[PDB]
């Protein structure tokens with residue numbers, strides 16, 4: 001598989017070992033890491049993590065992306081598809097982080113491109129993810145895009161996002177993915 005994920009103000013490309021420093025700094029930013037897993041601040045350890053990730057990637061088991069800002073080709077975050085299962089075909093996503101240099105709507109763009117990757121490039125039927133209780137605006141983002149709370153525990157709310165909502169959204173969110181081929185005009 002190779003991916004061609006590009007939206008209006010952002011694009012994605014697969015993580016390499018050399019992204020270790022950017023990732024370490026991102027994930028150890030205390031403004032950003034309130035609701036994600038603790039991870040090493042050691043560049044070589046993060047390089048190690050990426051090396052193992054690359055084996056999972058070579059086997060079609062995981063795809064991990066740096067998010068970039070299109071205007072200056074500068075890195076603005078991460079996102080990951082992982083933990084694949086069957087009956088029905090399901091993928092998780094997460095590791096979803098954008099820094100201060102993000103474009104205003106990078107969150108909308110990157111989510112949409114994740115669902116491009118999962119449902120159309122990779123053929124999944126269903127997406128699973130969770131969000132910490134307390135991460136209020138993230139809950140509110142996913143509900144708005146059409147995710148459904150399946151359930152919960154002491155830490156998380158658990159969601160699914162169906163392929164049907166992705167397709168059904170592709171028209172509605174088309175302005176985020178590219179230049180419109182034609183624009184609505186009212187008389």
Ligand SMILES: CC(C)(COP(=O)(O)OP(=O)(O)OC[C@H]1O[C@@H](n2cnc3c(N)ncnc32)[C@H](O)[C@@H]1OP(=O)(O)O)[C@@H](O)C(=O)NCCC(=O)NCCS
Nearest residue numbers: 032035096097098104105107108130131132138141144145
């Ligand atoms: C999670 C994260 C990537 C979300 O990015 P964000 O930039 O915070 O996302 P926002 O919800 O603010 O969305 C960006 C903009 O698009 C708008 N928007 C969001 N969803 C939209 C939708 N469905 N339709 C139209 N506009 C939308 C927002 O209102 C916002 O614009 P605003 O500046 O006018 O409010 C980011 O907050 C982050 O890195 N958080 C820390 C790490 C983390 O907790 N990750 C998630 C673990 S579950």
Ligand SMILES: Cc1cn([C@H]2C[C@H](O)[C@@H](COP(=O)(O)OP(=O)(O)O[C@H]3O[C@H](C)[C@@H](O)[C@H](NC(=O)C[C@@H](C)O)[C@H]3O)O2)c(=O)[nH]c1=O
Nearest residue numbers: 023035036037038039040049093094095096129130131132
């Ligand atoms: C991606 C990555 C992970 N790790 C460590 C951290 C942890 O010890 C282990 C497994 O990591 P995780 O699976 O928990 O990855 P993480 O990036 O922390 O994100 C996940 O756990 C968080 C607590 C959840 O909030 C994340 N959920 C989301 O981001 C869902 C999104 C759609 O809103 C979920 O995807 O690996 C690293 O050391 N380096 C890395 O680059």
Ligand SMILES: [Mg+2]
Nearest residue numbers: 002003004005
């Ligand atoms: Mg490409």
